[PDB]
Design a protein around this ligand. Sequence first.
Ligand SMILES: CC(=O)N[C@@H](Cc1ccc(OCC(=O)O)c(P(=O)(O)O)c1)C(=O)N[C@H]1CCCCN(Cc2ccc(-c3ccccc3)cc2)C1=O
Length: 106
Amino acid sequence: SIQAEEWYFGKITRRESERLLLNAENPRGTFLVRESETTKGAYCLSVSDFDNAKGLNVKHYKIRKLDSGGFYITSRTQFNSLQQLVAYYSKHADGLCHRLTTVCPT
Ligand SMILES: CC(=O)N[C@@H](Cc1ccc(OCC(=O)O)c(P(=O)(O)O)c1)C(=O)N[C@H]1CCCCN(Cc2ccc(-c3ccccc3)cc2)C1=O
């Protein structure tokens, strides 16, 4: 159950996710998963990043959920659960701004 996950923030807005992630104390890869503001049944993986060009900034990746069961950011790489997706992207940056590291503080 995703509701049970500490990185699942459920129904918060994109702006709020940004407010929480743009904390100077957050290293690259700080993240949270939330409901998409405008797509029923899809989620957003909000991730903090940092470089000298943009400083501290946030990237939002849409996570798709198949009726056929799979979770994915890119259809080429699917998972049986949102937990497995989160675990995979904590080890591989692949197309993300940074691999997932720590859950975002409130
Ligand atoms: C409005 C905005 O910010 N758009 C996001 C997509 C997006 C994300 C969340 C979202 O939330 C709803 C909300 O704000 O509530 C909505 P909305 O519902 O607002 O329309 C739209 C975006 O464009 N992010 C970028 C992220 C950085 C990379 C470039 N890109 C394309 C891409 C390329 C490669 C990969 C990839 C990832 C991992 C491995 C392999 C490939 C992923 C994305 C994005 O999507």
